[PDB]
Amino acid sequence: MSHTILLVQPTKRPEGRTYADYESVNECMEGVCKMYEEHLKRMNPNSPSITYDISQLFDFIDDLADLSCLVYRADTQTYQPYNKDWIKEKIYVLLRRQAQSLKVTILQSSDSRAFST
Amino acid sequence: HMSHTILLVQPTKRPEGRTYADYESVNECMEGVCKMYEEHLKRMNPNSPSITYDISQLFDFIDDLADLSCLVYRADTQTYQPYNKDWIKEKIYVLLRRQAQQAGGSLKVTILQSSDSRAFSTVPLTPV
């Protein structure tokens, strides 16, 4: 549970550079998936449940122009930098733990998640 | 110092306006804030070849910002160090004074809409 800032450059256009912050690494990592999930929720609005492989999640991330995060360390009172591929792993670790090839299904009816293998 | 610096901006309370830029050094990030205020003037005054602001005008415009922080890389820990709005304003106060030096009371900055470089002029007392 540490303050986490996320640097998102979606397209090569630098005016897209944006950021959000979260109370922990976890809801930052969930913040990324919720960015991809809102993208699928918007692509398929009439779909009640949208399923995606975790590879299409990483595919979306890979296509982002830039993604990085900054995690607070109370002992030094700074922010540690981790790059995109790091973030993808924490999302892999987060979604894998959430379940118990990974397949996530986006149940819009509940703003919740479900999994498969 | 001259380490990688990230600038976190937020003009209005509306978070969709959040953005960031990064710079090779702290001093190039501080100029980025000045240039952020400057171009806001140049766009407001497209018919004035030059515009001059007091440094305190640069500080009010920064208070208006919903949020403005910056992060400075630190090799000893390999981490980015946070700095709030006050720190940035003081760093700008110091940097522009040294830049005016090499060229109450307060400082006036004169920029040409053509250029990014600054011309400085010191003022006897500070405004109301």
Using DSSP's 3-state secondary structure scheme, residue B53 falls into strand
Total residues belonging to chain B: 128
Q: Which of B6, B16, B79 sits opposite A78 (nearest CB)?
A: B79
Using DSSP's 3-state secondary structure scheme, residue B26 falls into helix
| Cross-chain Cβ contact A79/B82 below 8 Å | yes
Please tell me what resolution, in angstroms, this structure has.
Answer: 2.8
| Cross-chain Cβ contact B21/A17 below 8 Å | yes
In this structure, the strands spanning B67-74 and B5-10 are antiparallel
Cα(A56)–Cα(B103) distance, integer angstroms? 56
Residue type, B36: M
Q: Count CA within 13 A, CB hemisphere, residue A58.
A: 16
Interface of A with B in 10-39 (CB under 8 A): 14-15, 17-20
Number of structural domains chain A divides into: 1
B127 within a domain of the structure (yes/no): no
Contacts of A14 in chain B (CB under 8 A): 21
**For residues B105 and B125, is the Cβ–Cβ distance under 8 A?**
yes
Interface of A with B in 72-91 (CB under 8 A): 73, 76-81
Distance (Å) of CA B51 to CA B32, B54, B105, B114: 17, 10, 20, 11
Buried b (16+ CB within 10 A) or exposed e, A35-47: bbbeebeeeeeee
Structure tokens at B66: 């919903």
For B17, the domain range is 2-122
What string of H, E and C letters represents the secondary structure of chain A? CCCEEEEEECCCCHHHCEEEEECCHHHHHHHHHHHHHHHHHHHCCCCCEEEEEHHHHHHHHHHCCEEEEEEEECCCCEEEEECHHHHHHHHHHHHHHHHCCCEEEEECCCCEEEEEC
